[PDB]
Design a protein around this motif. Structure first.
Motif, PDB file in Angstrom:
ATOM      1  N   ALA A   9      -7.499   0.465   3.681  1.00 49.80           N
ATOM      2  CA  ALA A   9      -7.455  -0.687   2.771  1.00 49.80           C
ATOM      3  C   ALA A   9      -6.554  -0.449   1.529  1.00 49.80           C
ATOM      4  CB  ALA A   9      -8.877  -1.096   2.347  1.00 49.80           C
ATOM      5  N   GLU A  10      -6.669   0.716   0.884  1.00 46.69           N
ATOM      6  CA  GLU A  10      -5.875   1.062  -0.324  1.00 46.69           C
ATOM      7  C   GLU A  10      -4.361   1.027  -0.051  1.00 46.69           C
ATOM      8  OE1 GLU A  10      -8.625   2.721   0.727  1.00 46.69           O
ATOM      9  OE2 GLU A  10      -9.992   2.575  -1.000  1.00 46.69           O
ATOM     10  N   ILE A  11      -3.935   1.503   1.144  1.00 48.31           N
ATOM     11  CA  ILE A  11      -2.523   1.562   1.582  1.00 48.31           C
ATOM     12  C   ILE A  11      -2.001   0.172   1.822  1.00 48.31           C
ATOM     13  CG2 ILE A  11      -0.806   2.695   3.152  1.00 48.31           C
ATOM     14  CD1 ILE A  11      -2.766   4.807   1.421  1.00 48.31           C
ATOM     15  N   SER A  16       1.293  -4.403  -0.146  1.00 50.00           N
ATOM     16  CA  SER A  16       1.370  -5.801  -0.640  1.00 50.00           C
ATOM     17  C   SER A  16       1.925  -5.820  -2.081  1.00 50.00           C
ATOM     18  CB  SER A  16       0.010  -6.496  -0.570  1.00 50.00           C
ATOM     19  OG  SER A  16      -0.350  -6.587   0.798  1.00 50.00           O
ATOM     20  N   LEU A  17       1.466  -4.879  -2.941  1.00 51.99           N
ATOM     21  CA  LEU A  17       1.947  -4.774  -4.346  1.00 51.99           C
ATOM     22  C   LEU A  17       3.445  -4.490  -4.347  1.00 51.99           C
ATOM     23  CD1 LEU A  17       0.181  -3.073  -7.336  1.00 51.99           C
ATOM     24  CD2 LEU A  17       2.606  -2.661  -6.920  1.00 51.99           C
ATOM     25  N   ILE A  18       3.914  -3.533  -3.501  1.00 52.59           N
ATOM     26  CA  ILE A  18       5.357  -3.201  -3.470  1.00 52.59           C
ATOM     27  C   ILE A  18       6.227  -4.400  -2.975  1.00 52.59           C
ATOM     28  CG2 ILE A  18       7.030  -1.773  -2.156  1.00 52.59           C
ATOM     29  CD1 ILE A  18       4.770   0.562  -2.500  1.00 52.59           C
ATOM     30  N   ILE A  19       5.734  -5.104  -1.958  1.00 51.29           N
ATOM     31  CA  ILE A  19       6.438  -6.282  -1.371  1.00 51.29           C
ATOM     32  C   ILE A  19       6.425  -7.491  -2.302  1.00 51.29           C
ATOM     33  CG2 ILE A  19       6.287  -8.069   0.612  1.00 51.29           C
ATOM     34  CD1 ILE A  19       5.331  -5.494   2.317  1.00 51.29           C
ATOM     35  N   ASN A  20       5.303  -7.776  -2.974  1.00 53.10           N
ATOM     36  CA  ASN A  20       5.171  -9.001  -3.800  1.00 53.10           C
ATOM     37  C   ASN A  20       5.531  -8.898  -5.290  1.00 53.10           C
ATOM     38  OD1 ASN A  20       2.084  -9.678  -1.980  1.00 53.10           O
ATOM     39  ND2 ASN A  20       4.134 -10.278  -1.407  1.00 53.10           N
ATOM     40  N   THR A  21       5.462  -7.709  -5.919  1.00 56.56           N
ATOM     41  CA  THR A  21       5.772  -7.568  -7.360  1.00 56.56           C
ATOM     42  C   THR A  21       7.255  -7.818  -7.657  1.00 56.56           C
ATOM     43  OG1 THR A  21       3.902  -6.047  -7.628  1.00 56.56           O
ATOM     44  CG2 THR A  21       5.498  -6.043  -9.478  1.00 56.56           C
ATOM     45  N   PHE A  22       7.531  -8.580  -8.748  1.00 53.29           N
ATOM     46  CA  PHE A  22       8.923  -8.787  -9.167  1.00 53.29           C
ATOM     47  C   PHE A  22       9.326  -7.462  -9.897  1.00 53.29           C
ATOM     48  CE2 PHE A  22      12.288  -9.894 -12.185  1.00 53.29           C
ATOM     49  CZ  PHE A  22      13.198 -10.509 -11.340  1.00 53.29           C
ATOM     50  N   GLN A 108      -1.743  -0.555 -13.976  1.00 52.92           N
ATOM     51  CA  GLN A 108      -2.649  -1.396 -14.780  1.00 52.92           C
ATOM     52  C   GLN A 108      -2.607  -0.875 -16.246  1.00 52.92           C
ATOM     53  OE1 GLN A 108      -5.413  -1.788 -10.777  1.00 52.92           O
ATOM     54  NE2 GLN A 108      -6.514  -1.027 -12.572  1.00 52.92           N
ATOM     55  N   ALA A 109      -2.405   0.452 -16.450  1.00 49.13           N
ATOM     56  CA  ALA A 109      -2.318   1.111 -17.760  1.00 49.13           C
ATOM     57  C   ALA A 109      -0.905   1.018 -18.447  1.00 49.13           C
ATOM     58  CB  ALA A 109      -2.748   2.570 -17.639  1.00 49.13           C
ATOM     59  N   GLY A 110       0.090   0.474 -17.736  1.00 50.93           N
ATOM     60  CA  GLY A 110       1.451   0.324 -18.254  1.00 50.93           C
ATOM     61  C   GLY A 110       2.597   1.042 -17.555  1.00 50.93           C
ATOM     62  N   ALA A 111       2.326   1.864 -16.493  1.00 54.26           N
ATOM     63  CA  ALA A 111       3.395   2.573 -15.759  1.00 54.26           C
ATOM     64  C   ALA A 111       4.261   1.629 -14.939  1.00 54.26           C
ATOM     65  CB  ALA A 111       2.815   3.694 -14.889  1.00 54.26           C
ATOM     66  N   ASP A 112       5.443   2.099 -14.478  1.00 56.68           N
ATOM     67  CA  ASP A 112       6.220   1.159 -13.683  1.00 56.68           C
ATOM     68  C   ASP A 112       6.381   1.704 -12.275  1.00 56.68           C
ATOM     69  OD1 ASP A 112       8.369   2.817 -14.980  1.00 56.68           O
ATOM     70  OD2 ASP A 112       9.482   1.669 -13.454  1.00 56.68           O
ATOM     71  N   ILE A 113       6.813   0.832 -11.352  1.00 58.57           N
ATOM     72  CA  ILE A 113       6.960   1.181  -9.921  1.00 58.57           C
ATOM     73  C   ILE A 113       7.816   2.455  -9.719  1.00 58.57           C
ATOM     74  CG2 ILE A 113       7.921   0.334  -7.681  1.00 58.57           C
ATOM     75  CD1 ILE A 113       6.663  -2.533  -8.711  1.00 58.57           C
ATOM     76  N   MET A 115       7.737   5.258 -11.049  1.00 57.04           N
ATOM     77  CA  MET A 115       6.932   6.467 -11.147  1.00 57.04           C
ATOM     78  C   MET A 115       6.137   6.794  -9.868  1.00 57.04           C
ATOM     79  SD  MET A 115       5.816   5.712 -15.030  1.00 57.04           S
ATOM     80  CE  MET A 115       6.991   5.632 -16.345  1.00 57.04           C
ATOM     81  N   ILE A 116       6.296   5.960  -8.813  1.00 55.85           N
ATOM     82  CA  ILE A 116       5.587   6.097  -7.520  1.00 55.85           C
ATOM     83  C   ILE A 116       5.584   7.546  -6.934  1.00 55.85           C
ATOM     84  CG2 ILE A 116       7.646   5.247  -6.111  1.00 55.85           C
ATOM     85  CD1 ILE A 116       5.541   3.814  -4.244  1.00 55.85           C
ATOM     86  N   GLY A 117       6.720   8.265  -7.039  1.00 54.06           N
ATOM     87  CA  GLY A 117       6.869   9.649  -6.546  1.00 54.06           C
ATOM     88  C   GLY A 117       5.908  10.643  -7.176  1.00 54.06           C
ATOM     89  N   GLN A 118       5.517  10.409  -8.437  1.00 57.35           N
ATOM     90  CA  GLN A 118       4.549  11.298  -9.151  1.00 57.35           C
ATOM     91  C   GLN A 118       3.124  11.227  -8.551  1.00 57.35           C
ATOM     92  OE1 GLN A 118       4.930  11.399 -13.619  1.00 57.35           O
ATOM     93  NE2 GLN A 118       6.677  10.044 -13.282  1.00 57.35           N
ATOM     94  N   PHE A 119       2.868  10.229  -7.691  1.00 57.48           N
ATOM     95  CA  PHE A 119       1.567  10.029  -7.064  1.00 57.48           C
ATOM     96  C   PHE A 119       1.566  10.408  -5.582  1.00 57.48           C
ATOM     97  CE2 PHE A 119       2.133   7.407 -10.876  1.00 57.48           C
ATOM     98  CZ  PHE A 119       1.016   7.759 -11.617  1.00 57.48           C
ATOM     99  N   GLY A 120       2.703  10.949  -5.099  1.00 58.84           N
ATOM    100  CA  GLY A 120       2.899  11.381  -3.720  1.00 58.84           C
ATOM    101  C   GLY A 120       2.831  10.263  -2.707  1.00 58.84           C
ATOM    102  N   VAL A 121       3.273   9.064  -3.070  1.00 57.97           N
ATOM    103  CA  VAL A 121       3.252   7.890  -2.166  1.00 57.97           C
ATOM    104  C   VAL A 121       4.632   7.171  -2.160  1.00 57.97           C
ATOM    105  CG1 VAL A 121       0.703   7.524  -2.027  1.00 57.97           C
ATOM    106  CG2 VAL A 121       2.014   6.267  -3.797  1.00 57.97           C
ATOM    107  N   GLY A 122       5.660   7.874  -2.599  1.00 58.39           N
ATOM    108  CA  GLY A 122       7.054   7.399  -2.693  1.00 58.39           C
ATOM    109  C   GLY A 122       7.599   6.871  -1.369  1.00 58.39           C
ATOM    110  N   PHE A 123       7.100   7.379  -0.213  1.00 56.80           N
ATOM    111  CA  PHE A 123       7.564   6.812   1.091  1.00 56.80           C
ATOM    112  C   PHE A 123       7.424   5.290   1.119  1.00 56.80           C
ATOM    113  CE2 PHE A 123       6.303   4.932   5.196  1.00 56.80           C
ATOM    114  CZ  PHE A 123       7.464   5.213   5.921  1.00 56.80           C
ATOM    115  N   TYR A 124       6.306   4.758   0.574  1.00 55.90           N
ATOM    116  CA  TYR A 124       6.055   3.310   0.616  1.00 55.90           C
ATOM    117  C   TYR A 124       7.026   2.482  -0.219  1.00 55.90           C
ATOM    118  CZ  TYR A 124       2.187   4.513   3.559  1.00 55.90           C
ATOM    119  OH  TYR A 124       1.399   4.967   4.592  1.00 55.90           O
ATOM    120  N   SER A 125       7.845   3.118  -1.096  1.00 57.89           N
ATOM    121  CA  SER A 125       8.886   2.409  -1.859  1.00 57.89           C
ATOM    122  C   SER A 125       9.951   1.902  -0.892  1.00 57.89           C
ATOM    123  CB  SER A 125       9.507   3.294  -2.950  1.00 57.89           C
ATOM    124  OG  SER A 125      10.321   4.315  -2.387  1.00 57.89           O
TER     125      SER A 125
END
Ligand SMILES: CN1CCc2c3c(n(-c4ccc(C(N)=O)cc4)c2C1)CC(C)(C)CC3=O
Length: 208
Positions: A9-11, A16-22, A108-113, A115-125
């Motif tokens: 579910a989280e993935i 959806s966030l990566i596809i829909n966010t401007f 939600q705290a103010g980071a931007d897309i 920074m995705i690599g710092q969370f080890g999920v950069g493949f989804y970019s």
């Protein structure tokens, strides 16, 4: 046979966030995929120091970037450690769940897309620029597989019937109609120079 699986579910939420966010700074997808390749090449290189036979499937450690305007695809190929069927279906997804939750909280705290690599999920970019992603991979301990997903909450895994790779991964980005700038030689050279200039493996940009 083609096996179909539901993403955790989280993935599915992350995709959806990566596809829909401007977010106009889409070019960071390439550094994220090159980073995944570089980490896989460091892994096979390290493993080979205690077991040289791990390089029988290919001694060359490199990254190739292959644009194809006819198919509207950008392929990132590496001769890294590759991924087993367990990595593709379960292991990486499990690791990714914790990083996705932390990344979504940071956003939600103010980071931007970017920074995705710092969370080890950069493949989804990859989904910033691709409507579908196909991953062909071969690990020394397993068969050649093809993973694929156009998002929508599912992915497929099948044994791969195409050209044998020896060892490594190919990430094929079926680009969105308005993202063809990533097939242009000067645009790819610019991105590699800006974000990936110090990668410790040869990066060859193929021309059309
Ligand atoms: C640290 N990351 C964790 C999550 C992750 C994922 C995938 N990779 C991944 C992508 C490419 C490579 C490579 N080039 O060897 C390795 C891991 C990673 C790495 C692909 C994948 C198709 C299995 C999907 C995935 O969740």
């Amino acid at each position: 046979e083609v096996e179909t699986f539901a993403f955790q579910a989280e993935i599915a939420q992350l995709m959806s966030l990566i596809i829909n966010t401007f977010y106009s700074n889409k070019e960071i997808f390439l550094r994220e995929l090159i980073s995944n390749s570089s980490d896989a090449l460091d892994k096979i290189r390290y493993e080979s120091l205690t077991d040289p036979s791990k390089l029988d499937s290919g001694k060359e450690l490199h990254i190739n970037l292959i644009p194809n305007k006819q198919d509207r695809t950008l392929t990132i190929v590496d001769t890294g450690i590759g991924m087993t069927k367990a990595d593709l279906i379960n292991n990486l997804g499990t690791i990714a769940k914790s990083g996705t939750k932390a990344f979504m909280e940071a956003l939600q705290a103010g980071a931007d897309i970017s920074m995705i690599g710092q969370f080890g999920v950069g493949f989804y970019s990859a989904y910033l620029v691709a409507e579908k992603v196909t991953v062909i991979t071969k690990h020394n301990d397993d068969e050649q597989y093809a993973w694929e997903s156009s998002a929508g909450g599912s992915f497929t895994v099948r044994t791969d019937t195409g050209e044998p790779m020896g060892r490594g991964t190919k990430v094929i980005l079926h680009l969105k109609e308005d993202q063809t700038e990533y097939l242009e030689e000067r645009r790819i050279k610019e991105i590699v120079k800006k974000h990936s200039q110090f990668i410790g493996y040869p990066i060859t940009l193929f021309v059309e």
